[PDB]
Curated annotation (Swiss-Prot):
Name the record gives this protein: Polycystin-2
Gene responsible for this protein: PKD2
Domain of life: Eukaryota
Residue range from the parent sequence: 724 to 796 of 968
Family statement: Belongs to the polycystin family.
EF-hand domain location: 27-62
Length: 73
């Protein structure tokens, strides 16, 4: 979605499919694997249609207040 390849370029975001968008980016996949864990919208990356149905990236919008305590984890 940030760049436009094809389905990944505008549609759904996946780890392995994210590569489609940024194919050639990264040295090792583990580096990308590391970043998605905290910084992906759902912290998943390999997501199909959930993100797509929103049409708008809800990650960018920090509408909800991230509290200190979030109950468990």
């Amino acid at each position: 979605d940030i760049s436009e390849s094809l389905r990944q370029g505008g549609g759904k975001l996946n780890f392995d499919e994210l590569r489609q968008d940024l194919k050639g980016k990264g040295h090792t996949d583990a580096e990308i694997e590391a970043i998605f864990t905290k910084y992906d919208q759902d912290g998943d990356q390999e997501l199909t249609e959930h993100e797509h149905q929103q049409m708008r990236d809800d990650l960018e919008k920090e509408r909800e207040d991230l509290d200190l305590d979030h109950s468990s984890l």
